[PDB]
Amino acid sequence: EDRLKIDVIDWLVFDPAQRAEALKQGNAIMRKFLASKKHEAAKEVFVKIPQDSIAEIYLPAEDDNAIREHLCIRAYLEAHETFNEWFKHMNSVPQKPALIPQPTFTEKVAHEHKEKKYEMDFGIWKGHLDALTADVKEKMYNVLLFVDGGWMVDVREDAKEDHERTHQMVLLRKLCLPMLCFLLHTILHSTGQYQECLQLADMVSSERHKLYLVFSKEELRKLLQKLRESSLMLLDQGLDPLGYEIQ
């Protein structure tokens, strides 16, 4: 039935006079797929939506929200497109030169070089990494700290009742905000940014976002056993739990 739904979109996109209904329905369809984490499904739909839809449509409470929801959804997708690239890279680290104990004088020199070339690649694989870390992070904070009212949260409050959508928007927050936090923690930990890891407890507990309400009690503790792990590595470095110099 996947196709039935992703195909009803091209029918609504065809007629430009129904772009407001095409987007709204595109949202709904992408709300079902997100709850299943079908990101190639959600995105295959996301491209069918002409890149210039938003511009033309220009506002009923149903169109202000659907424009916001669409960008929220793009902010979410882009937060998985850049992580899978980053993650793919983290798993392609240059491998150490192989050792040939009891080497011939030939094998000694081939190895002096293979050992010197590797000490060039590992520097760039931290180079490319840093730039894929700086980018995946930004996206994770665009979703977690979504501007003007939080992620998947309507700004317009005068639409007509849509319990399906509304409760779909509360759910999407409870499936994906705990899951984006845990990823960002995994990104920060993987790159050794431990001080910042611990600063996820400010972001989450914050009264500005009230992200902690989107967490189950279990997920919290789990995030608290994740932070205590970053803390350790900060002690091993000689700093206090939170990364500040011990005077």
Place this chain on the structure above:
Amino acid sequence: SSLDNIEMAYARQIYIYNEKIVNGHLQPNLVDLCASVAELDDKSISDMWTMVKQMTDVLLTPATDALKNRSSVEVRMEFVRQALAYLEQSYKNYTLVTVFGNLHQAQLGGVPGTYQLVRSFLNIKLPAPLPGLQDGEVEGHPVWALIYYCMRCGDLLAASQVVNRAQHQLGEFKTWFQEYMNSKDRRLSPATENKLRLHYRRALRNNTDPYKRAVYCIIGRCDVTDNQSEVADKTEDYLWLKLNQVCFDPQDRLTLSQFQKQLLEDYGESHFTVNQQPFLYFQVLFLTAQFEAAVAFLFRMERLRCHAVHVALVLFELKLLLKSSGQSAQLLSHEPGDPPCLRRLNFVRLLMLYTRKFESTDPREALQYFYFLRDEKDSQGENMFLRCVSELVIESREFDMILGKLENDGSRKPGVIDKFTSDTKPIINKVASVAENKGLFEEAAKLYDLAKNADKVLELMNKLLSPVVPQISAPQSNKERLKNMALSIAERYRAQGISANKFVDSTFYLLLDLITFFDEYHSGHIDRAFDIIERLKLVPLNQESVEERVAAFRNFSDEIRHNLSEVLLATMNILFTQFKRDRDSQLRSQARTLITFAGMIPYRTSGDTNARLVQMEVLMN
């Protein structure tokens, strides 16, 4: 079964004719093989084949083109004689059943001489004397009646005897007739032929004795327009009257081409089928050498399809049927670069129609008829018989019966097509090819495996396994039903030393090992399952192997990379369980290895997997 009693009997006869050619034996007489069934039906059909045999029993030039034999004046002349000999003998049987009530009744008393029969035939059909007869009588009958019906029965000798007893009355007709009986091809010399024709035309154009009129222009082949309707009232009497009047190379003359065309063009089926008697028209076309017309015509009668197809086959196995080159033409047509007086039969279409009826539930019999198309191809080059077997297998789905079932023990019990050609590698791929194009992989594998095409068998077997690698193998599941066939293909491929290219082959045996890895993992045999994954050297367990294992993943079949997620988790969960039961350092070290590998590998669900892997390693410490 879709075959009626008559059709079935013909099928068996065509199986024999095929069994003979398939084993190289003598080419038996097809016409005889078909008349063998005709006698099981009413004589309406028997008398047809009698005509078919006698019309095709002409001295031919073996290994000569069909169009050439049928255009040659040599052959065209013998057709007329074979027909006249049929119309004469056929009429002779009518004269017997007219005098005696049954052919058997005539035989027991003995067939009388054609003279005494004819005399005993005149008694009935003219009891009282007609006042317009001439030249007196002979032993109680008009001399001209005896001469006509004797010639009609085909016994010229019996007719000449009548002439010898009326020498004084008949005048100069004796020396003329005695020449006709002597000269071959039922023709007189131009000089004498001129003498009699002018005499008849002089003052006998309208004589009160119709029998006299008939004989004269049967001997002189004159007055072609006058159908002598006084004596030739039946249709066969007309055909016979005219075939004794046709000529070969300008006035008062008729040729076979004109006559054959004149008959069906001006007086088509409509004229000869008003009495709702179909064979009457068929005999008109067949006894005039228009075999294609008669075949198509008779092929449309839904009750006589069987008979018309076979009379086509006979004409086809005798190089007498004129096939239509193009397969896009109608059933009956005249080629543009041929004379208008001949027609052509789209033989390919003819059989294709007949077959569709009983091809669905009677495949064996269908093949016997498809064989006659072995000598023809299509626009794309395929062999028509081979293509017909492909289409018949795609539709009927009768693989074991027609293609030969390849059991799971390594045997190949031959199929019905094996009889006709020993090169069965292409069609098995053709049938396997489409079923592959229709997502029927489990079948395409069995079919490709039937032709020992391991390149395709293992390819498809890779696709059917990868989805089911991590699944739970349960009784009658789709895993068991696929794993058990894959293993039955692994043994038969090792015992027979068969293998595809190493890429396809390596992946195939690799999946089989993984399927064993999860079957042991889902059973709780942790120790045993850990040992298997270690052999495969697919997931690194010591930090030193990470570099090489990571490079290998890049060129491993995507059917493997797909299942990498479930492999890492099972392997981790394996170490995970063994931890709760120095060794602790060793598991801890291996735990780390899996993570770094997964970290450097971009793969399916790397997000959820890499996270779970790290959590399970933390609980260990």
